[PDB]
Write a protein that binds this ligand. Structure first.
Ligand SMILES: CN1C(=O)C(=O)c2ccccc21
Ligand SMILES: [Mg+2]
Ligand SMILES: [Zn+2]
Length: 164
């Protein structure tokens, strides 16, 4: 239906092999009451490009922040505390969140804490009446075949931490 939120975020790739390197791609994300979808962004024409994927909101089980990477590259470094800066808002993406569904977690990186908060609040609103909402989550990333939080080697492993 109507677009609730539209933003440019980094999306982390779904790791095929535990030894394989991770890719972070800049995409346009759209949220409606029915779907969360992501697209290539056509910078030159200033519009969304081809659709890369879509998740029916009814399939989402959890939306929360993720503990940040311990040694991120400059593109994902958190700035020191304290009017929108045009360059940084499309170049730096330090604030990650996770959208958990049928196929496991999707990791998305926001340029600001405020924008991450807006997306987590709205996603929690659209999923509020879902039937498979979980009570537990993984506070840390699934990286190189295991969760950094609990060392579990299954992506579908029940969250190690109870949601507050
Ligand atoms: C679909 N897809 C891929 O195939 C890939 O390598 C990647 C990296 C980030 C986000 C999405 C991706
Ligand atoms: Mg536009
Ligand atoms: Zn865990």
């Amino acid at each position: 239906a109507a677009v609730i939120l539209e933003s440019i975020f980094l999306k982390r790739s779904q790791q095929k092999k535990k030894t394989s390197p991770l890719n972070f791609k800049k995409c346009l994300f759209l949220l409606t009451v029915h779907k969360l979808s992501y697209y290539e962004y056509d910078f030159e024409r200033g519009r969304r490009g081809s659709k890369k994927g879509s998740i029916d909101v009814e399939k989402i089980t959890c939306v929360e922040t993720v503990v940040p990477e311990k040694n991120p590259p400059p593109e994902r470094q958190i700035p020191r505390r304290g009017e929108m800066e045009q360059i940084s808002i499309i170049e730096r993406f330090p604030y990650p969140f996770q959208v958990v569904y049928d196929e496991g977690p999707l990791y998305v990186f926001s340029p600001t804490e405020e924008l991450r908060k807006r997306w987590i609040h709205q996603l929690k609103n659209v999923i509020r009446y879902n039937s498979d909402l979980v009570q537990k989550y993984h506070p840390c990333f699934w990286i190189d075949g295991q969760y950094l939080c609990c060392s579990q080697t299954a992506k579908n492993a029940m969250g190690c931490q109870i949601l507050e």
